[PDB]
Amino acid sequence: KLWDSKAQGEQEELHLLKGSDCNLTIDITEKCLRLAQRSAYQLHTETSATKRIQKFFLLGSLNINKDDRVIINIDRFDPGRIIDRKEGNKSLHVPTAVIPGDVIIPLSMQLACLGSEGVSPFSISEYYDAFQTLTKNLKLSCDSVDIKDMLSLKIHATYYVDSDEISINVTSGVVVPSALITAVPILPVSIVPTALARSLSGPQDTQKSGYVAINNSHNLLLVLDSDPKLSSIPLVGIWVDGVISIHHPYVWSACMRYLYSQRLTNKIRDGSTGFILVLYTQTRPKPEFWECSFSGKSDKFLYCQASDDIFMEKVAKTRNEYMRLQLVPN
């Protein structure tokens, strides 16, 4: 045995939305929706044979509240640019300017023909391809763990304009990995007191994470997520700093990242054997140790949509009105 796996506390079940009661909240500022409708109507009037389906992007920020409540605050519309790689004749549709920290939400909107009770948001023809691309990015990324790389959200909006007001039915849908991480508190393991370990047990509310290596003396060495030795060094887990508890969604995101990464080719401890998590919480001077395991289906995902009507005055009252959407999964 590489270390002692005896449980020192209650088991915990990890998932992205566990702390948030499986609920994902979306707040969209009525101003950015109004800009989206304006652009859609211009497009819809610039050509007459093309059916009215506009292609835009919305831009948001990811925020996590007092009680681990995940909220996406979408407040910027960006019509986007078209670029041509010349691989295929069809031109490509891309956001205007991808900002680091921006949640990119593809926005499709169309004027409803007569009446559409059935709502199909984030259809499989486009959402499915987008989510395949998303998980492909999640498998190969070398960057720090980012909660934004863990979900793919799209919005379909059906709108109508009359002389008095603009009315819009907004259906917003998201997909995300379903994997639950089983976590068991375990007894502390000796860590080589390197400079990283000393700075880690020391004192900003910025999350950071890394990976866990082992040396000849069977002592644990903490490693940065940017260390080039990671490609073949034997890895047994991760370290995470800067959260209040294990229920913070950043922890589930880091666990998923460790399990999925194919840049780490020497993961001698994984989900079947159990791997180590060194958690440097903000409420304790020393880290907590957990053994994590997973045994279910690897490529299964959670998804859902929400929809609501909104009625807007033609004149944008100088308010900060917004629309709140929740998560109602299948």
Residue numbers in the entry: 13 to 215, 222 to 348
What does the paper say about this structure?
Here we demonstrate that CEP85 is essential for faithful centriole duplication through a direct interaction with the previously uncharacterised N-terminal domain of STIL, a key factor involved in the early steps of centriole formation. Subsequently, through its C-terminal PB3, PLK4 interacts with STIL and phosphorylates it, enabling STIL to recruit SASS6 to the site of procentriole assembly.
The structure of the complex was solved by MAD using crystals of the corresponding selenomethionine derivative. The structure of the CEP85-STIL complex shows a 2:2 binding ratio with one STIL NTD bound to each of the two coiled-coil strands of the parallel CEP85 cc4 dimer. Compared with the unbound CEP85 coiled-coil structure we did not observe any density for the N-terminal half of the coiled-coil, probably due to its partial unfolding in the crystal. The interaction between the CEP85 coiled-coil and STIL NTD involves mainly subdomain 1 of STIL, in particular the region of the β-barrel capping helix and the crossover hairpin-loop that, together, constitute one of the two conserved patches in the STIL NTD. The crossover hairpin-loop of subdomain 1 of STIL NTD contacts towards the N-terminal part of one of the coiled-coil helices, whereas its barrel capping helix contacts towards the C-terminal end of the other CEP85 coiled-coil helix. Due to the relatively low resolution of the complex structure we could not resolve any sidechains. The structure of the complex between STIL NTD and CEP85 cc4 indicated that the highly conserved residues L47 and R50 in Trichoplax adhaerens STIL (L64 and R67 in human STIL, L60 and R63 in Gallus gallus STIL) and human CEP85 Q640 and E644 are located at their interaction interface.
